[PDB]
Write an enzyme that holds these catalytic residues in place. Sequence first.
Site, PDB file in Angstrom:
ATOM      1  N   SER A 112       1.409   4.314  -9.386  1.00  0.00           N
ATOM      2  CA  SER A 112       2.478   5.183  -8.869  1.00  0.00           C
ATOM      3  C   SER A 112       2.140   6.664  -9.174  1.00  0.00           C
ATOM      4  O   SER A 112       1.020   7.099  -8.915  1.00  0.00           O
ATOM      5  CB  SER A 112       3.782   4.752  -9.506  1.00  0.00           C
ATOM      6  OG  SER A 112       4.821   5.057  -8.657  1.00  0.00           O
ATOM      7  N   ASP A 126       5.125  -1.841   0.195  1.00  0.00           N
ATOM      8  CA  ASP A 126       5.645  -0.841  -0.764  1.00  0.00           C
ATOM      9  C   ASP A 126       6.793  -0.050  -0.106  1.00  0.00           C
ATOM     10  O   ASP A 126       6.563   0.582   0.921  1.00  0.00           O
ATOM     11  CB  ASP A 126       4.505   0.116  -1.116  1.00  0.00           C
ATOM     12  CG  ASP A 126       4.849   1.093  -2.235  1.00  0.00           C
ATOM     13  OD1 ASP A 126       3.904   1.600  -2.900  1.00  0.00           O
ATOM     14  OD2 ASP A 126       6.049   1.321  -2.491  1.00  0.00           O
ATOM     15  N   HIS A 151       5.937  -2.078  -4.497  1.00  0.00           N
ATOM     16  CA  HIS A 151       5.410  -0.938  -5.250  1.00  0.00           C
ATOM     17  C   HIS A 151       4.889  -1.352  -6.611  1.00  0.00           C
ATOM     18  O   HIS A 151       3.815  -0.973  -6.987  1.00  0.00           O
ATOM     19  CB  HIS A 151       6.491   0.128  -5.431  1.00  0.00           C
ATOM     20  CG  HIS A 151       5.973   1.452  -5.893  1.00  0.00           C
ATOM     21  ND1 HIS A 151       5.021   2.175  -5.187  1.00  0.00           N
ATOM     22  CD2 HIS A 151       6.258   2.168  -7.004  1.00  0.00           C
ATOM     23  CE1 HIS A 151       4.758   3.292  -5.856  1.00  0.00           C
ATOM     24  NE2 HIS A 151       5.504   3.318  -6.953  1.00  0.00           N
TER      25      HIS A 151
END
Length: 405
Positions: A227, A321, A355
């Site tokens: 991330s 995601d 994600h």
Amino acid sequence: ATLILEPCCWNEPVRIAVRGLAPEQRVTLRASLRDEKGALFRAHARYCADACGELDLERAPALGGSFAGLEPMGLLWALEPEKPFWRFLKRDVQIPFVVELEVLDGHDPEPGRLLCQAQHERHFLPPGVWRQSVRAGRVRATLFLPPGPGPFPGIIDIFGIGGGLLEYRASLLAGHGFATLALAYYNFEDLPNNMDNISLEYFEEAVCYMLQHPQVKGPGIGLLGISLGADICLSMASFLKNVSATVSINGSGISGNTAINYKHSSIPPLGYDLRRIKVAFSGLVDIVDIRNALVGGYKNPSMIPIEKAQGPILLIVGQDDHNWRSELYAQTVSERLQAHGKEKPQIICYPGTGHYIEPPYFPLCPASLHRLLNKHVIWGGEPRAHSKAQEDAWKQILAFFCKHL
Ligand SMILES: [Cl-]
Ligand SMILES: [Cl-]
Ligand code: NI
């Protein structure tokens, strides 16, 4: 009538077996655990014993429950919390989770009689891995060293937004022969309490700490980020010395909400706009579109100048995601490298994956409070497909760092 676990760490496959059942008996298996704040996680599945009154989870399919089909590790990867929006995490890596396993008679919703019980500890600090808190200069981190003479190939591990210091990825990696540094950068002890600016000098100091440690092999270090952490790892690779190889999991490859600074260089933020949130029928929010358009593509001023990196790059992407468009971004990063005459990075794209690609058998959390926005957001991912993505990505990461470190 007995429950067998053969032959241990959360990310390791195990063989669950039951002997001593009636021939072809109908049973429910149930798995349960309380996490570190007392929240309950549970999963179940229905089965039939074979003719010898034996059940083997690696050969017998679940007929129903929290999952169905041939899923040997389902009782662990399909665990769901009682409390909604509650995420499966490990904050204290030195204390294991105890999983209560149970075989009950029948397939009825109202649970049958208890045929057997077993408690198995699942670990996050592998055998003989040593853990030490690191306070060196302004650096706040935790170091995990494998057992043996050393020195060991070294990796720094960086999470995204959330802050604090989560160690569970670094501790498990340490079980494969890497010295690993879990690195905090905000919302932890004396570090800033926010993320108004990414200054790369802090992360350079963490690199320097690693490369000067007697038990870290070198000549460079590996970087592993998810991330925002992935973006920080790509920025470090772009600007700093002694980075040997970089893995990004659902990174974006750009300065997003906050500028990325290093000495006399700044990468301007692309920005976002909250009016681009989409509210699902359920009331869940989807933020996948909030970021401003990556106009010009790889020529966009907001691009991390990843062509400057000397080592190889692996990009791991969840195709589902919902935090942001990791797939599109990975391609653009690839296009950036190729245009400045560098080799295509390796990209691995996982379908049905969101994600948060955690280590193997970490249950999916489909939605939780987004801390900046103060609303419940979807993260993407389907449980089965996400779980196979998490198993495979772990091996891809090990293979990549083995080869390059
Ligand atoms: Cl399933
Ligand atoms: Cl972010
Ligand atoms: Ni819906």
